[PDB]
Symmetry: D2
């Protein structure tokens, strides 16, 4: 279910926005790609969001959780076996979490998906 | 991502099997149903498998993990807000995990999906 | 790709609304259910819309075509081999096409999906 | 539902096979991509097969129809707005229809999907 974590950069704190960059590997053996479920395997939106939420709340907004998706945009499908760069930016002020997925192949780096999510205090 | 656990009966041991019955609630707020990812919300197989594996390895086969799907069969779609009975039977001998999902509505109980999964000793 | 047409009632013209009722059989051999594509076969939204559009413009609004989906609502999945009642109501005034799908089993009739679509004159 | 036909080369008859090549445009307005049905739009297999069968039976095997999918393989997802080359080869002897989809971008041409289908004489 989860991606293989290649590298986890240190958190870059600025004024209000925090940042963490991860290099992830989309494992061909993830249930997301099992032949019994799909013949055109690609990382679905639920998984992309889920991964975003797991890293965002364990590394940037520990006491927060999902409220809503302000906007998501899937530009390129993510296939099994791809290497991804995941950038998460959290602005506790506006309570907005910005994310970005990019596929690294050769010397190229294409954006696969990006979006803004609203989070809320836990048991606020 | 997980279902709301309603009831967890006790493990029922026999010769070489371990059974566990659970009543789960398929929360409408699961990411699996987010409007941004689908208009026809239904519990996908990855989710049905993911849940089967989670309870199985935490309640019946603690030191085991997924190897392969011997056979799965989806008979009825599972909609958001449904109440489900999940029966897991584990035969450590044949190393086979049998599961069964049924939807409870009114006085009825229909099978939604069932299957057999092969598991393997972790770090074996 | 199309459903088997069991019965096609006569058009019931009233003041502004024109109607037609079809009984359809969802054939188990439709490409929509091919094992190579889906493991949990069910009639997807595109197909449901396509069928609505095909009957609606060859029987009620001959010189019109799709513009947009004002609202759709999927309440019950449609499985392979089911018998369906399809009701189409067209109000050329408001240029609105209303549709309704219901599954007939035993003495019951559940609504599977319904919605309103806006159409526009062809080559208008 | 159908793709926009850009170019249709002539049938290329050899010794035992028949061939036709088409350049198609995957129109962003197809129902296959309607926002109400998906957030990650991509040409599904049902659509890819449906198109293959349509051109094949109207250009190469007029008196034939689908029997079964000997093998299909989806290598690259097809996004809305892409230009595709579709190659169909029909061997009436072995009654096998071979197809191949490739995406044209820049100077590149990647295979998106390919497969072999068995057809049968209609009313045979």
């Amino acid at each position: 279910m989860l991606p293989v974590e290649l590298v986890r950069h240190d958190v870059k704190k600025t004024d209000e926005t925090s940042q963490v960059e991860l290099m992830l590997q989309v494992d061909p053996d993830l249930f997301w790609f099992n032949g019994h479920f799909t013949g055109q395997p690609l990382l679905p939106g639920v998984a992309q969001l889920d991964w975003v939420m797991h890293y965002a709340t364990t590394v940037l907004a520990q006491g927060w959780t999902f409220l809503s998706i302000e906007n998501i945009k899937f530009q390129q499908p993510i296939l099994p076996g791809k290497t991804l760069r995941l950038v998460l930016i959290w602005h506790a002020g506006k309570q907005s979490l910005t994310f970005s997925y990019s596929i690294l192949e050769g010397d190229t780096e294409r954006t696969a998906s990006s979006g803004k999510i609203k989070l809320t205090p836990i048991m606020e």
